[PDB]
Design a protein around this ligand. Sequence first.
Ligand code: NA
Ligand code: NA
Length: 327
Amino acid sequence: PQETLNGGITDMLTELANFEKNVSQAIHKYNAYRKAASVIAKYPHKIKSGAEAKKLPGVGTKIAEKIDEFLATGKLRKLEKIRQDDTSSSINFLTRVSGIGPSAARKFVDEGIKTLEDLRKNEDKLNHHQRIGLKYFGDFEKRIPREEMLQMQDIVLNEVKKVDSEYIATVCGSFRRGAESSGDMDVLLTHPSFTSESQPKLLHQVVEQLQKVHFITDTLSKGETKFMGVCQLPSKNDEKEYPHRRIDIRLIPKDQYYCGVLYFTGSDIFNKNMRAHALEKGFTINEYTIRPLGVTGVAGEPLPVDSEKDIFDYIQWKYREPKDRSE
DNA sequence: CCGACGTCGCATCAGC
DNA sequence: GCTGATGCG
DNA sequence: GTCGG
Ligand code: NA
Ligand code: NA
């Protein structure tokens, strides 16, 4: 619908969510508030009362009472109190640094480290990831327009093919689904020589090549199947430099690749629905495999999958393009 | 009432 | 040194 | 916090 409709409510809930996650360390309270904000963000009416909102799935008595207070007064007392409280605001703010989660942010604030300037003054208290998150603080909160994501895809597919024309690489996420912008880049990689019953630097070689051409600029973490790092499109010799961007690269067994591509293409709602329909047809899908279910509920051996459509055929569903996987 | 709520690879730390 | 827990994305 | 066994 429209922000003007329930943006005040959805903004209030998202702020309460962040405080649960970052200050309370109550991840489930956080996900509850976020779910409430999302169902409400999709409701195509300006909500008039908590009782109206409570009909919606994920809004309960508490959030109904909060909505009543917000509508009548324009604010939530408890959010106003958290907002001004120096400890809570600082903890919440510091978690915006990649690699600083609620635990580190609490420790920093417990010793007087509250601001980016405080972090910048205390480099030796930061691990390598947190230093990189600090270095690119502003860049990492920017969205990536699709035209840039295309240019980034072009570099990644070219360099991957240059290492070995046998690699398969798929940029997934909302971008795959036609998203006009993105938050990071999620690259899924496989090779025929890598199966579930068969890593030989096949991830390292792609990362190295991407580093050798100066696309990947920093490494947050890297092992034999998952890389998290920083990348940046090349400038134009005389043009504002592009911002640095977060990029993940996953190496997946070939026999699990299209289940991985399906899963990490999403959306989250679409995945829940396809998983649900799959159970009601006798199958279980996870990020790795589709397996048939016995009459007693015992999952059998994973079934051969060589394309996304294969999965749809198993469950007797017509192939849905990434565009049409919003839900 | 009261437990579930998504999963996991990797970096780092606790403990031995 | 090694194994397991915890934090984090 | 919300849901549901
Ligand atoms: Na409800
Ligand atoms: Na963070």
